[PDB]
Design a protein around this ligand. Structure first.
Ligand SMILES: CCCCCCCC(=O)OC[C@H](COP(=O)(O)O[C@@H]1[C@H](O)[C@H](OP(=O)(O)O)[C@@H](O)[C@H](OP(=O)(O)O)[C@H]1O)OC(=O)CCCCCCC
Ligand SMILES: CCCCCCCC(=O)OC[C@H](COP(=O)(O)O[C@@H]1[C@H](O)[C@H](OP(=O)(O)O)[C@@H](O)[C@H](OP(=O)(O)O)[C@H]1O)OC(=O)CCCCCCC
Ligand SMILES: CCCCCCCC(=O)OC[C@H](COP(=O)(O)O[C@@H]1[C@H](O)[C@H](OP(=O)(O)O)[C@@H](O)[C@H](OP(=O)(O)O)[C@H]1O)OC(=O)CCCCCCC
Ligand SMILES: CCCCCCCC(=O)OC[C@H](COP(=O)(O)O[C@@H]1[C@H](O)[C@H](OP(=O)(O)O)[C@@H](O)[C@H](OP(=O)(O)O)[C@H]1O)OC(=O)CCCCCCC
Ligand code: NA
Lengths: 463, 463, 463, 463
């Protein structure tokens, strides 16, 4: 019959080694795979840190080089408030760019024609943007305005080894002023540490932003980096990873196929021998959830590794996507180590406890999600005008979530004690709102989560 | 008889659909109502954020424009300490107001006659207030004083496209100096984003406050906003909300009436058939608590929505009350989603667990409230002189409440280690006070809350 | 016999009202007493806040008036590092004192002869203190030194409606420089708010401290206040409190005596009727622990109230002791409200749960106190040189106690990541030290506290 | 037979005192030993604090004396950004060194020939280090470079009671600039407090670090201290400690030997009388784990104390190792006090509860360590570029560990809300990453730890 077949299936790997003495091949390939993807990620991260620090250190210098009166820590507050401050900040940036070779501590080269589209072959583009028609007159509430954006650009060229000073800003109708230029530098560390060619190109954008027309013009400096090569093992290790995961993917895929076949042969044997019905869940047991994790992580590592090879050779620069693919795959393979612990009864007791408590925990989350959401909306609408932590809905969730886990509680209460939301009614509401939310979720909801787990443990211990 | 009537009543909605096949009308109207009030609140909040940011950004600029030597972050500390500092801060504010057109980055218009009652048609009123008779002489402890407040006001008028410099302050008897004026601006974003007429009027009040007569005169700037129109779907959606909640209110009210009638017919059927007694609680079961929530939230949304329509058209400006009405209603409708989960046994187990634990939790709160209050009073009286967190009773409660939830613990201990309350006895007391309070409430009181919930869960699981 | 007597004793007050119909007199006097001592403390605290704020606001002004280059927030860091900085800071303080009338915003009077013992009738005493013999020579490690302190004082007198500039500091042997003077002011708020005579005298002490001889001389300013009267209900309420607590003390004392007598009559009735033995505990049951609390709090309120009357009339100024006496008494009377809840079975279940868990919790505290202490000593000795939070033993306990309650964890880890304790070995140790301590105490010790309480609850529920 | 022997063995000490009336000698020596090692550590720590504060206070002064424009709190940010700033910072340090006698508040002596190896008999060595061949040209990506480090040093000699101003820095190829010199001072406090000879020598190193070649040159000042003697009970107490621990080591070692012998005599008595098998664990019971702790701590105290004697006499200066040896020994002896509590049944219930829960807790830690590690790697790779808390793997673990214990949660969420990781995809990932991690570990993993302990308690209570 097949009971012998279905007996081998659904058996422990240790037992499987006594019947037919099949060598453990997936088990040893999984342990190899955990080691290579983990080392690959560590190598990726170590080199990515070096690039991040170089880009960040240079951007700090640009702020000190080009932003008038700039000090560390005043990035969100850095702003101009008068017409002359705005003029002085703009002229300082351009003035500092023109003497950059003789003042800067880094070796920055002018990138001819780096001012962007607005530049006519110039290396620095000083643009001001305003509406076609402002005609703003608060004196009699008259607002003849044509929202069409008119860009007025000035071309500045670097000295070989001043029209911009004649800049008039249309303050009443102004939208923003931008300074665009590029600077080329060489990452010296690379030429000594790994003898790697690394010519960075920095696209500096200094924005004097008046889109809010609120009398306050924030000033920020931003950089984009283009890493080229100034005119191995890592690649070999990357191919090794792709092979190890590709081999793992096939064997796991093969095992999954065997389950689907065995499931098919069973659905009819019971529908003939007994004519008995089989539900969709009854067939899930033929599905190995761990193997689903393994192939899912194989796909992420191969797909993530392919993009990483492009990044290493200077062709992709899609760090965000590659890092997420490799990070999530690495998380999955380490999680997959739980499967090995399920082969031991003492460890399986704990893992099984979480498995049987998980449906109750998920159900309780839906029950309390609606209470949580109601508080989020209530707090955002009421406390948003007054509380720095309730400004956006996503910020409200982060605040409330931290509160129920006992973090940042007093500062939340202190913010509402400072000016009281400029209202006794609002201050009184914040008291009921925060006291009831924290009391409910910590003393009752959190206590129920403990009970669900303890109940699951009790049943696993005492079947 | 009526057992058939009372059987339909107290039945699940799913069962109700088999008997008489009554369409679920309240159930579908509740789900519609959850969607419209939630979207209405989100729309209210998104637009309220835009107004709040514009008002806040302008107020920051006014502080930089009018407050001498002002820097961000020094709002609570901003103060003058000498006679010449006070003079320089006052003259700077008035001097900056008179050149505002040619220095400011925003477009601010002078509001003629905006100085308030003290102004005689002037746009800026510089007032100093002092007692009628000061005669303060600490040299021989003589205090001839007439507390009557004498307001001395100076009229300043803006330049068309200096008497204030001749200001003498009666320092010995001074109460405060205030500068009042108004500035009119137009929210440009509105004319481009939603083509909405929005002429703001800012009432700026700069206070040099000496009511404490402590040698330190704090300086603050405050603004009041009057949003008018410079010379739709939102309203249609608001009527839709009022109709949806009004329809929900009637049906829920009707259902509530049916319960009261059925309760009346039962009180006498059992008092005739059996002559048996019925207690007040026995009649509560005819009361649907969920329907009480529904009509309560209907009233809040309609009442809140009516005020919101006034705000949208520039007639009310009662944001605080409207936001609380809409916030609390929205919280209630999302909470009301719990009722739907009670129709499923697996979810009902969790909801029922909290319901049966709730009386024990409430009783334990009263038991521990008196211990908590005793600590609050003890800490305020003893540590109030020395600890920044124990200054007021409401502040003490916020500090202690955060402590028992494991927040801001070390800073509380650090404050008392800095100067030790300038007393070994006080420092020693703070140690016993804080160590005993945290140990008692975390290790015993909090552990009891867990036990009450676990006991409630045990009984629901094992009846 | 006496079983009727011992039956009335050990009965509930409600039952006591049916037998002999004795009016509840202590019960109503306790509720009255809770109300009067709580209101008395609130009145004490409200007025104490006003004095504290006035003293603090004046001290801030003195720092701005007399400390060269002083800014808020730099109190612990304020120091001089060169000989000329020290000279400039000293001369600034004296220079500012001599023009105080014409620059200050408060009304400060010179107190003739206020310079202290060092002053010879002068209002300001500028003292420098140095060793008799310094002869410090690090060039050849020679240290001829006579530790006798020689005080060199200079007398400065205020202008009627400069020898100090000729000051030479013996830097090599210097200990400190102090400036002593007094300033008299009148709390104007008092003469308007409560028409109360309040002439403050401020003893200002500015210390330039070189006792560490470390090249850094910290500078601090301190004030002592002497509140006199410049030339009611509160007192009546204070007598009411003393009477209410004195009446409560007698009745509780009387009840306690009745217990001791009844205990005596029982010890021999059982030693005659049965000749049976009675242990010391068996006689404790005749002791009413609540009455012990009541008389203990009566003594604190009367003793605390007596001192408060002296403070109110300007004769004591012992705020610390009075506040502790009134704070601790008030805590006790609110705690005593628990007794009333023990008369109700539902509430008594919770209170009894904590009572029966309390011995196990106390025993577990002794078990874990020795582990806790071992960590405190280990951390102080090892991490004290490197970590700002491990500088003193009391600071270490505050740090560790906050850690196990989930507070200030990341900053503790961050401090050791900054410079790594300037040692890999020390950094590695800090990792094991902190990870093992937090893991042990949160996951095991804290989990046991929950178990002890849950076990106590289980036995109370299921006897 | 031996059952009488094995009966004395494995008996309580109290019982042991009735059989043969053997005086408790180890028990009284352990209590003595706890007292002496604890007092020894406190004495070590108190004196070590004094040295640490003196070294730290002097280093702060050096920063104010030698670092141009230095202010407290700007140690990590202190940096130069232009060629002239770097020149001014270097010349200021050397200029301030040459006038140190007449400006400093401490008594610092020049150490002739203290400039280090680079110095040719000079007291201050100003060195600049650069590559042999820079030839950096970002204009056409040309990088002819010879990484050989060339040190160019300038000799500066102090005035007896300027070639450095002629310094040209090779900015394009520069690695760092260092200033080395030594200053000798005498700890005056020592000559007055303990009449102790203490001549400190400070090796000051000021580094202008350009190894990153990022346009930003951080500036830091570091000191090394050499404490000699300028030309008792503590030592006697140290010998007392060594004797007490040496005596304890022998007796504990003797007792351990008795167990091994008794184990040997038993292995064969049961293998003859019964011929029964004995497993390795069955023989562990003859091992007294407490005695293992005692001898282990004896070794640490003696070894730690020996090094401390060298430090006290000015010969070792290995504070880190000595402090760890004495700290860990002291922790062990206080932990060993648990053994005494195990002799009492009420206390033993608690200690035994933790002992029987410990294997389950350790197993659960391995189960959750792999999930924890997967999150650590995922977060470091993805959030490392964007989040200040995810920069290194050890930092990630500290962040995640604090999160699950409810600390620093909101700031972690806030950092990702600031710039959103400059990517919606990254921001969305951070939401799933943090919400799932905190929810999983707090609501499930932490709840299981409580269950394991409660289950262990239940079995101890109810065998
Ligand atoms: C195009 C697709 C072709 C795929 C063909 C793959 C065929 C193939 O090799 O499987 C046999 C073993 C796999 O070894 P391995 O995966 O370790 O062992 C298998 C598992 O034990 C599986 O149970 P679970 O995984 O627990 O559900 C069991 O049912 C399989 O069939 P059985 O019990 O009747 O024996 C075993 O063969 O092979 C190797 O040991 C690696 C050799 C390199 C494989 C890659 C060669 C390209
Ligand atoms: C001035 C006051 C007049 C109020 C008159 C209202 C009369 C009216 O319509 O109710 C019937 C249904 C309500 O539909 P709906 O509320 O969904 O259904 C009712 C509920 O099931 C109720 O039980 P619970 O709510 O669970 O306690 C049940 O006892 C009612 O009586 P029954 O079992 O004998 O049938 C049902 O009619 O109506 C509509 O489906 C919407 C039509 C628009 C209603 C607004 C018309 C203006
Ligand atoms: C110098 C010392 C003299 C002290 C003399 C005090 C004598 C005195 O009055 O007690 C009777 C009641 C007290 O009233 P009150 O304390 O409320 O009632 C007593 C308690 O119920 C007590 O039980 P517990 O407290 O529960 O242990 C009970 O054993 C006493 O004796 P009994 O059952 O045989 O009746 C009762 O008299 O009195 C007043 O109702 C206030 C009148 C003002 C008392 C102050 C007068 C100066
Ligand atoms: C070179 C090595 C020589 C080591 C020789 C040491 C021999 C020696 O003294 O032990 C006897 C007692 C120890 O006293 P003490 O350690 O308190 O008592 C022992 C313990 O009770 C031990 O049980 P546990 O520790 O519970 O496992 C027990 O089996 C021993 O043998 P017994 O039951 O047959 O009597 C007892 O003698 O001695 C002193 O009371 C201190 C005198 C100073 C010892 C240092 C002298 C240099
Ligand atoms: Na916390």
């Amino acid at each position: 019959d097949l009971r012998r077949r279905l007996k081998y299936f659904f058996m422990s790997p240790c037992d499987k080694f006594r019947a037919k003495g099949r060598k453990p091949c997936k088990l040893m390939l999984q342990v190899v795979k955990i080691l290579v993807v983990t080392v690959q990620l560590i190598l990726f991260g170590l080199s990515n840190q070096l690039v991040v620090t170089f880009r960040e250190e240079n951007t700090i210098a640009f702020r000190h080089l080009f932003l008038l009166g700039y000090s560390d820590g005043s990035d969100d507050t850095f702003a101009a408030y008068t017409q002359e401050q705005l003029y002085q900040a703009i002229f300082y940036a351009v003035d500092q760019y023109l003497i950059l070779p003789e003042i800067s501590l880094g070796r920055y080269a002018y990138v001819r024609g780096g001012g962007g589209p607005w530049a006519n072959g110039s290396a620095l583009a000083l643009c001001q943007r305003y509406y076609h028609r402002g005609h703003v007159d608060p004196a009699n509430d008259t607002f003849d305005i044509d929202p069409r954006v008119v860009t007025d650009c000035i071309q500045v060229d670097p000295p070989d080894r001043a029209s911009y000073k004649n800049l008039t800003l249309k303050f009443h109708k102004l939208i923003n002023v931008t300074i665009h230029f590029q600077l080329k530098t060489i990452n010296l560390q690379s030429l000594i540490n790994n003898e790697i060619p690394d010519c960075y190109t920095f696209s500096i954008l200094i924005t004097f932003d008046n889109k809010a027309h609120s009398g306050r013009i924030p000033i920020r400096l931003e950089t984009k980096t283009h890493i080229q090569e100034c005119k191995s093992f890592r690649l070999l290790f990357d191919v090794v990873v792709i092979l190890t995961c590709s081999l793992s993917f096939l064997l796991c895929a093969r095992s999954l196929l065997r389950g689907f076949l065995l499931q098919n042969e069973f659905v009819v044997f019971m529908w003939r021998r007994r004519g008995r019905e089989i539900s969709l869940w009854e067939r899930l047991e033929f599905v190995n959830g761990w193997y689903i994790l393994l192939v899912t992580s194989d796909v992420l590592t191969i797909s993530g590794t392919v993009m990483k090879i492009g990044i290493e050779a200077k062709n992709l620069a899609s760090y965000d996507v590659c890092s997420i693919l490799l990070g999530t795959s690495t998380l999955l393979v380490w999680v997959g180590v739980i499967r090995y612990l399920t082969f031991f009864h003492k460890y399986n007791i704990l893992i099984a406890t979480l498995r049987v408590a998980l449906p109750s925990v998920m159900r309780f989350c839906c029950c309390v999600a609606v209470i949580y959401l109601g508080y989020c909306f209530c707090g955002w609408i009421v406390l948003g005008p007054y509380h720095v932590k309730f400004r956006s809905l996503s910020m409200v969730s982060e605040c409330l979530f931290s509160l129920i886990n006992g973090d940042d509680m007093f500062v939340t209460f202190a913010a509402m004690q400072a000016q009281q939301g400029h209202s006794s009614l609002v201050w009184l509401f914040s008291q009921l709102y925060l006291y009831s939310f924290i009391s409910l979720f910590i003393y009752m909801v959190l206590s129920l989560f403990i009970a669900l787990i303890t109940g699951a443990y009790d049943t696993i211990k005492h079947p």
